[PDB]
């Protein structure tokens, strides 16, 4: 071939291959900056996490450590705080003994420890609502970390004795007995309990406090059959005029009718089922409900009425977790280390062409 054309065409090359390389250089610089700006933003993200996000997440984690402990405080300390409250409200002493002051399992524990009979232990065990209404509770030592208080339980000196609850009305010059209340066969005598506050009554069981009781001899019962008795002086209230009033009892009622006063009985479904002559009559609660004496109505029977209801629907808690799409992320990082692995391939293939 021509040999100046081989130099002028060869020169054509060396130039088209220099202007070539000068473009590839602006390409690696263009990219050195895109990586340098992407690099700073990866540092602004790691820094938004380390200096902004992470710190809040730590305080939120601390504020829930607080909240969850204030509640686990009042929950685990549920009993001690209910005691300190009702000692506060009652300024030291409380009656009756609550189920915070003393749980039931413990009460029974105590009952089985008192110096009493297996038949007295058995009684109290069955009437706890009553053994409690008759027990006190008394603060002794209270320090920050512990609270000790004495509990005071009753002890019965006698059990299984006949009791009777005496009611009375006028009798016409009029006469009214004024020794109403409870009577109990104490050893050899009758024990009488004037105030109806010192006697609790469960079913056919009666617990009484012999502290403000008078002791009477058994003759006091002859009174029931005759006011004027040679053996015992009955307690009476004399009036020199006619007087009428009802005395509703446990199982029924009494009705003293004397003079121009009109006393009738009635039924809820039947109406006036009776009228009273001037006399001392007794009406059972099985038959009669109310009892008009003059214009003042007496209700011989508790009157059932409107039932009320209050409904509460379950409350729903919603917890919707957060989940990062991590696998599709790692597959693109995998793809990016692919473009790097093979990016270095082509440069190695290139360096071998330069021997």
């Amino acid at each position: 071939g021509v040999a100046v054309s081989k130099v002028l065409h060869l020169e054509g090359e060396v130039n088209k291959i220099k202007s070539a390389l000068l473009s590839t250089n602006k390409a690696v610089v263009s990219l050195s900056n895109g990586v340098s700006v992407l690099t700073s933003k990866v540092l602004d993200l790691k820094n938004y996490i380390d200096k902004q996000l992470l710190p809040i997440v730590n305080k939120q984690s601390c504020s829930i450590s607080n909240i969850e402990t204030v509640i686990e405080f009042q929950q685990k300390n549920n009993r001690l705080l209910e005691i300190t409250r009702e000692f506060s409200v009652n300024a030291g002493v409380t009656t009756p003994v609550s189920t915070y002051m003393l749980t039931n399992s413990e009460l029974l524990s105590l009952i089985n420890d008192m110096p009493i009979t297996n038949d007295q232990k058995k009684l109290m065990s069955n009437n706890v609502q009553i053994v409690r209404q008759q027990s006190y509770s008394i603060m002794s030592i209270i320090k920050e970390e512990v609270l000790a208080y004495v509990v005071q339980l009753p002890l019965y000196g006698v059990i299984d004795t006949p009791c009777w609850k005496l009611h009375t009305s006028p009798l016409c010059i009029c006469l009214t007995r004024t020794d109403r209340g409870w009577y109990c066969d104490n050893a050899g005598s009758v024990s009488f309990f004037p105030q109806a506050e010192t006697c609790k009554v469960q079913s056919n069981r009666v617990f009484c406090d012999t502290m403000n009781s008078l002791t009477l001899p058994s003759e006091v019962n002859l009174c029931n059959v005759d006011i004027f008795n040679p053996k015992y002086d009955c307690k009476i209230m004399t009036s020199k005029t006619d007087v009428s009033s009802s005395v509703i009892t446990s199982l029924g009622a009494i009705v003293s009718c004397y003079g121009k006063t009109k006393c009738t009985a009635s039924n809820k479904n039947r109406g006036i089922i009776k009228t009273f002559s001037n006399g001392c009559d007794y009406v059972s609660n099985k038959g009669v409900d109310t009892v008009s004496v003059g214009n003042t109505l007496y209700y011989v029977n508790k009157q059932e009425g409107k039932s009320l209801y209050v409904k509460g629907e379950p409350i729903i808690n919603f917890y919707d977790p957060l989940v990062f799409p991590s696998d599709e992320f790692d597959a693109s990082i995998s793809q990016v280390n692919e473009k790097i692995n093979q990016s270095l391939a082509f440069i190695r293939k290139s360096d071998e062409l330069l021997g």
Partner: protein
């Protein structure tokens, strides 16, 4: 129906019979001691720096305890 009602006209008094009695004649004093499940606090910074719930719940309890000590 052990409980029964008897009515008298000679004294004009009704009477409930058939109860069985227990009569208090003494007391029985037991001593109950209840410990506090105290909270051992790891102090830290929270959402709102002005709200220290662990601390305040305790100061509120310590104080209720103090008000009781002053009744003796």
């Amino acid at each position: 129906q052990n409980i029964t009602e008897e009515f008298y006209q000679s004294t004009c008094s009704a009477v409930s019979k058939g109860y069985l009695s227990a009569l208090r004649t003494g007391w029985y004093t037991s001593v109950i001691t209840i410990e506090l499940s105290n909270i051992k606090e790891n102090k830290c910074n929270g959402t709102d720096a002005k709200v220290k719930l662990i601390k305040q719940e305790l100061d509120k309890y310590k104080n209720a305890v103090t008000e009781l000590q002053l009744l003796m």
